[PDB]
Amino acid sequence: LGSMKTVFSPLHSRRHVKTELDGGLLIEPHEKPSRAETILARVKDQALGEILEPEEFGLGPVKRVHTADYVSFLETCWDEWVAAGKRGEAIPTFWVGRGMRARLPKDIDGRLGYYSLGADTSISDGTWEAARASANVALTAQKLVAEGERAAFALCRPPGHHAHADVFGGYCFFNNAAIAAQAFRDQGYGKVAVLDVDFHHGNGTQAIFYDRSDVLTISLHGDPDLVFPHFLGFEDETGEGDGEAYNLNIVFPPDTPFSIWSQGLEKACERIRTFAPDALVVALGVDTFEEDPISFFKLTSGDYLKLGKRLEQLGLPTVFTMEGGYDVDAIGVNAVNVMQGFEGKS
Amino acid sequence: PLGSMKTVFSPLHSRRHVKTELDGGLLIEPHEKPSRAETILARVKDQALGEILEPEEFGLGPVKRVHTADYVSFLETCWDEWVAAGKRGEAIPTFWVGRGMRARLPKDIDGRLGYYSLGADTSISDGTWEAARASANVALTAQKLVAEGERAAFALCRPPGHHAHADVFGGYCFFNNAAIAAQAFRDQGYGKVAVLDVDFHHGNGTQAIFYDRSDVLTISLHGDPDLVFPHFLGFEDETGEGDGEAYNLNIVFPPDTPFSIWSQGLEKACERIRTFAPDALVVALGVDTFEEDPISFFKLTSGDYLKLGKRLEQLGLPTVFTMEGGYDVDAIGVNAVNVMQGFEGKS
Ligand SMILES: NCCCNCCCCCS
Ligand SMILES: NCCCNCCCCCS
Ligand SMILES: [K+]
Ligand SMILES: [K+]
Ligand SMILES: [K+]
Ligand SMILES: [K+]
Ligand SMILES: [Mg+2]
Ligand SMILES: [Mg+2]
Ligand SMILES: [Zn+2]
Ligand SMILES: [Zn+2]
Numbered sequence: 001l002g003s004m005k006t007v008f009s010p011l012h013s014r015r016h017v018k019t020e021l022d023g024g025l026l027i028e029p030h031e032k033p034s035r036a037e038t039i040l041a042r043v044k045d046q047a048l049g050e051i052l053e054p055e056e057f058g059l060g061p062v063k064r065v066h067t068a069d070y071v072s073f074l075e076t077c078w079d080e081w082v083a084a085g086k087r088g089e090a091i092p093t094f095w096v097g098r099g100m101r102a103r104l105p106k107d108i109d110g111r112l113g114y115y116s117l118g119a120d121t122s123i124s125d126g127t128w129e130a131a132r133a134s135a136n137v138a139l140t141a142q143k144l145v146a147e148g149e150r151a152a153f154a155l156c157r158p159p160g161h162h163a164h165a166d167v168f169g170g171y172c173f174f175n176n177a178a179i180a181a182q183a184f185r186d187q188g189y190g191k192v193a194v195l196d197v198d199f200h201h202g203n204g205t206q207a208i209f210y211d212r213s214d215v216l217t218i219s220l221h222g223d224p225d226l227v228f229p230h231f232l233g234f235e236d237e238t239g240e241g242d243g244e245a246y247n248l249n250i251v252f253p254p255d256t257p258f259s260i261w262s263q264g265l266e267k268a269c270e271r272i273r274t275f276a277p278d279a280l281v282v283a284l285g286v287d288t289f290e291e292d293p294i295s296f297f298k299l300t301s302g303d304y305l306k307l308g309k310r311l312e313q314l315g316l317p318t319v320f321t322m323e324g325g326y327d328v329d330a331i332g333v334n335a336v337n338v339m340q341g342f343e344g345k346s
Numbered sequence: 347p348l349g350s351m352k353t354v355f356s357p358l359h360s361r362r363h364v365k366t367e368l369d370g371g372l373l374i375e376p377h378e379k380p381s382r383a384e385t386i387l388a389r390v391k392d393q394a395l396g397e398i399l400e401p402e403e404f405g406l407g408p409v410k411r412v413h414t415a416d417y418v419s420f421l422e423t424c425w426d427e428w429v430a431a432g433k434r435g436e437a438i439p440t441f442w443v444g445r446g447m448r449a450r451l452p453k454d455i456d457g458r459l460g461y462y463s464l465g466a467d468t469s470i471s472d473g474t475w476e477a478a479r480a481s482a483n484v485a486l487t488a489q490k491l492v493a494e495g496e497r498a499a500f501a502l503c504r505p506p507g508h509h510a511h512a513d514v515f516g517g518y519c520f521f522n523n524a525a526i527a528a529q530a531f532r533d534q535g536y537g538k539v540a541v542l543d544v545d546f547h548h549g550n551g552t553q554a555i556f557y558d559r560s561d562v563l564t565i566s567l568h569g570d571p572d573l574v575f576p577h578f579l580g581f582e583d584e585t586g587e588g589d590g591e592a593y594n595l596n597i598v599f600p601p602d603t604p605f606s607i608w609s610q611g612l613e614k615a616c617e618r619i620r621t622f623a624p625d626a627l628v629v630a631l632g633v634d635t636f637e638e639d640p641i642s643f644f645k646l647t648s649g650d651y652l653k654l655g656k657r658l659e660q661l662g663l664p665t666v667f668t669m670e671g672g673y674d675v676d677a678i679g680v681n682a683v684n685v686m687q688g689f690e691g692k693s
Contacts, residue, residue, distance in 0.1 A: 024366065024428075024435020024469065026373060081371075088371020095442050097464025097514045099554045100578035102445050110577035117444025119466050122371070167444050207446045230457035231447035 002343030003049035005152050007140045010053075011133035012036050012157040014126030019089050021119045029122070030294060030326045031171040036157040039322065042332030043155070048339055054136035055143070062135050062174055064182045065208055069104070070166035073115055074173055075128050080108040090123035092116045117162075117169035117203075117229070127158075131173040134158055138176035141319050142183045145279070151318040153339050154180070159323040161202035161283040162229065170229060175204045177283040177321045181215050184279040193218065193277040193316075195268055197307065198285025198323040199295040201233030201249065205283065211241040216275045218248040218268045219283075220261065222296060226254065246275075254296040258303040261288065265310060272314060280316040286325035286334040293326055304334050308341025318342070349690035350396035352499050354487045357400075358480035359383050359504040361473030366436050368466045376469070377641060377673045378518040383504040386669065389679030390502070395686055401483035402490065409482050409521055411529045412555055416451065417513035420462055421520060422475050427455040436469035464509070464516035464550075464576065474505075478520035481505055485523035488666045489530045492626070498665040500686050501527070506670040508549040508630045509576060517547065517576060524630040524668045525555045528562050536625040540565065540663075542615060544654065545632025545670040546642040548580030548596065552630065558588040563622045565595040565615045566630075567608065569643055573601065593622075601643040605650040608635070612657060619661060627663040632670035633681035641673050651681045655688025665689075 013033045020029040043051060063071060081090040084107075095113035096102050104114050112123075134156040141154035154176060161177055162170025181192045194209070196202035196219035209215040224233040239247040248271050250264040272280070286304065288297040311318065320339065325331040337345075360380045367376040390398060410418060428437040431454075442460035443449055451461050459470075481503040488501035501523065508524055509517025528539045541556070543549035543566035556562040571580035586594040595618050597611040619627070633651060635644040658665065667686065672678040684692070 019371065021368070021438065021440055021466070023433035024438045086370035091368070091371045091466075093368055093467050094465040094516070094575055094577055096445060096578045097511070097516065098443060098449050098461075099511050099514060100464065100550070100576070101581075101584075103578060103581075105577045106572040107574065107577065109575075110572075113577065114445070117447065118441040118460075119368070119438075120440050164444070164446050167446060169441070169444065203447065225453040225457070227454065228441055228456075229447070230441060230452045230454065230460065231443045231450055234448075234450075237448075 001345055004339050004343055005050045005052060005144055005149060006043050006048060006155055007052055007054055007137045007152065008040055008155040009133040009137050012130050015130035015158055016126065017089055017122040017124050019122050021091060031158065032328070034328050035325065035331055036155060038328055038332040039155055039335050042336040046336055046340065048336060054133060054140040057136055057139045061139055061179055061183055064186060065165060065175055065178045067166040070115060073111060074131060077112065077123050078125055078127065084108050092119050115167060117167050121169050121171050127173065131158055134160070135174040135176055135179050138180045138321050139183060142180040145317045145319050146184070146187055151320065151342060154319060154321045156322045160321060161196055161198060161205050161323050162200070163204040164207045170200065172204060175208060177281045178205050178208045180319050180321060181281045185214060189278040191275065191277040192279045192281065193272050193275055194281045194283060195272065196220065196283040197288070198283055199287040199292065199297055200227065200285070200324065201229055202283055203229045203232040206232060206237065206247055209243065210239055210247060211243040213242045213246045216246050216277060218271060220250045220252070220264045220268065223251045223253055252297065255298055257298040258300065261297060261299065265307070269310065269314060277316065280314060280318045282311060282318060282320045283323050284320045284335065284338060285323035286331060289325065289327055289330060289334055291327040291330060301330065301333050301337060302346065304337035305341035305346035308338040312342045348687060348692050351686050351690055352397045352399060352491055352496060353390050353395060353502055354399050354401050354484045354499065355387050355502040356480040356484050359477050362477030362505055363473065364436055364469040364471050366469050368438060378505065381675050382672065382678055383502060385675050385679040386502055386682050389683040393683055393687060395683060399487065401480065401487040404483055404486045408486055408526055408530055411533060412512060412522060412525045414513040417462060420458055421478060424459065424470050425472055425474065431455050436471045438469050439463045439466050462514060464514050468516050468518050474520065478505055481507065482521040482523055482526050485527045485668050486530055489527040492664045492666055493534055498667065498689060501666060501668045503669045507668065508543055508545060508552050508670050509547070510551040511554045519551060522551045522555060524628050525552050527666050527668060528628045531626040532561060538622060538624040539626050539628065540619050540622060540624040541628045541630060542619065543567065543630040544635065545630055546634040546639065546644055547574065547671060548576055549630055550576045550579040553579060553584065553594055556590065557586055557594060558590040560590050560593040563593050563624065565618060567597045567599070567611045567615065570598045570600055599644065602645055604645040605647065608644060608646065616657065616661060624663065627661060627665045629658060629665060629667045630670050631667045631682065631685060633672035633678055636672070636674055636677060636681055638674045638677060639672065648677060648680050648684060651684035652688035652693055655685040659689040
């Protein structure tokens with residue numbers, strides 16, 4: 001069996017929010033620190049490969065994807081919120097409704113709404129530090145692969161694939177997969193593919209590269225007619241301008257099992273083959289699991305070994321970025337199964 | 347003796363009685379509470395302002411002259427769909443059409459909730475549909491009273507309406523009562539209508555509804571949206587579009603603005619109404635301009651509302667007043683009724 005290195009930062013635990021808006025109530029958040037700790041423990045248990053901490057790349061590579069005003073806002077948001085006298089965690093209350101102007105206001109409540117797409121992603125002390133560490137985790141995995149590793153596992157937390165150039169949400173702040181893909185491009189890789197196997201549509205990644213033909217973006221996901229993110233992810237979204245034909249969405253209905261999901265995976269792999277990229281980023285979520293509380297697919301733990309094996313057969317330099325997966329008990333087995341299948345297990 | 351003004355009030359407003367409002371990251375007791383309407387009604391009775399009438403039922407026809415059919419359907423079914431989907435809190439949006447996403451109506455109730463909203467502070471629960479319907483009938487009954495010969499009528503609406511677009515709810519508003527009354531004037535043959543929004547917040551819904559039209563002049567005085575709700579409309583450069591260019595007027599004020607400066611804006615609005623020469627006037631009346639209001643930063647005094655009502659009467663127009671905001675429940679009755687009493691000649 002092969003080996004794969006994992007990048008992990010203990011600084012993820014700086015993000016430890018207490019509240020998530022869900023069904024009209026404030027609940028304990030789904031995207032909790034134990035997710036990364038459970039995955040880490042399985043990486044060690046299975047001796048997957050070397051575990052390393054990230055290097056500090058600074059904001060340069062983050063700002064190749066995200067706007068400067070957005071990066072500034074994420075660093076100051078919590079200070080601005082506390083200073084304005086709010087007593088809860090930072091949660092948007094108002095946003096740019098249909099018919100309103102996409103215009104950045106001065107007030108923190110208006111700024112919060114301008115930069116968000118949902119109210120379930122509370123911001124509090126340590127969110128900036130954790131988001132910075134997570135992007136460095138992704139950049140460190142990309143450096144490992146650029147320097148010669150076939151693949152590397154970026155154990156990111158918070159996840160990234162829902163963040164736009166200048167919008168946070170879906171538990172995401174910096175788009176780690178897009179940051180890694182752009183780093184490949186800046187280092188001379190002519191074409192990069194990003195494949196999103198998380199249950200939810202990678203709307204941030206789609207938006208970031210939507211008018212570009214040098215980065216192919218593909219996502220398999222639950223039908224947004226029915227699930228988050230609702231307002232992107234449909235199969236008719238194929239790109240715009242030079243990017244037309246360089247975005248591919250593959251949608252599935254409730255209770256979809258691996259036997260059908262893997263048919264979409266095969267279509268994605270055929271699209272990657274014709275694109276013929278120089279590097280692959282896989283935005284990996286295991287909320288496709290049959291026990292996941294906020295998804296409706298029916299993948300089993302053994303199916304992740306099959307997924308990893310199929311991804312290896314693409315024969316590409318591959319960075320895996322950790323996205324979702326919210327049955328905390330099974331998240332380690334399921335995520336590491338993808339890496340182990342990539343390395344030849346089962 | 348003062349003149350008399352009839353008030354329309356529906357006991358059905360108390361069907362809207364939500365338990366939660368998102369505020370500052372917490373779920374708090376809602377500001378827009380039933381005691382607001384009961385405190386105003388009590389003052390109307392105590393001051394013997396005039397006859398108090400219950401509304402007539404107009405149906406959804408006049409509502410759909412302003413609001414889209416799909417939005418009206420959504421508001422009727424939202425609570426039933428929410429409960430059927432197994433949610434345990436009140437109906438509050440969690441996700442919406444972010445910048446860069448598609449304005450596309452989805453099937454799921456969370457998606458529809460976000461599609462049709464501009465904020466998460468406006469919980470929906472059982473009775474919200476019924477209360478919003480009755481509130482629109484209150485505005486239409488006041489409009490009918492004026493069209494049948496009354497100089498003015500006070501529509502004691504709850505919930506308020508001026509933040510609702512043709513197909514967006516928010517800011518405690520569901521049906522835009524002021525816009526519905528204005529459109530009723532137009533449909534009845536009044537050639538030109540002015541809607542004057544003196545609530546502390548921008549009447550963004552009213553502006554949006556009539557934004558490409560010149561037959562309805564919309565004017566709002568309000569706190570600077572750089573600083574306060576609704577944040578993304580209400581700026582002075584928003585003057586209308588298409589055939590409505592120059593028929594929307596936003597007058598913006600900064601924190602701590604007193605009546606001595608606010609009334610300069612009111613004179614500007616009155617001059618714009620004069621040149622427009624409308625056949626009827628709807629006043630979207632909020633008294634959250636009051637110095638003690640917790641949701642606002644202007645400094646009007648109770649006596650200033652007498653002056654406001656007097657000045658509005660001097661426009662010489664058939665006038666419907668629709669109740670909007672005002673959240674210091676203690677003085678909301680004095681302040682709102684002072685506008686009507688000042689209009690009828692009090693001090
Ligand atoms: N309380 C809202 C639950 C849904 N949250 C959005 C889905 C996030 C997927 C992240 S991979
Ligand atoms: N919890 C948010 C408080 C702000 N709510 C918007 C202001 C509504 C006044 C409209 S008349
Ligand atoms: K996906
Ligand atoms: K693309
Ligand atoms: K106003
Ligand atoms: K207009
Ligand atoms: Mg504010
Ligand atoms: Mg849903
Ligand atoms: Zn997910
Ligand atoms: Zn108001």
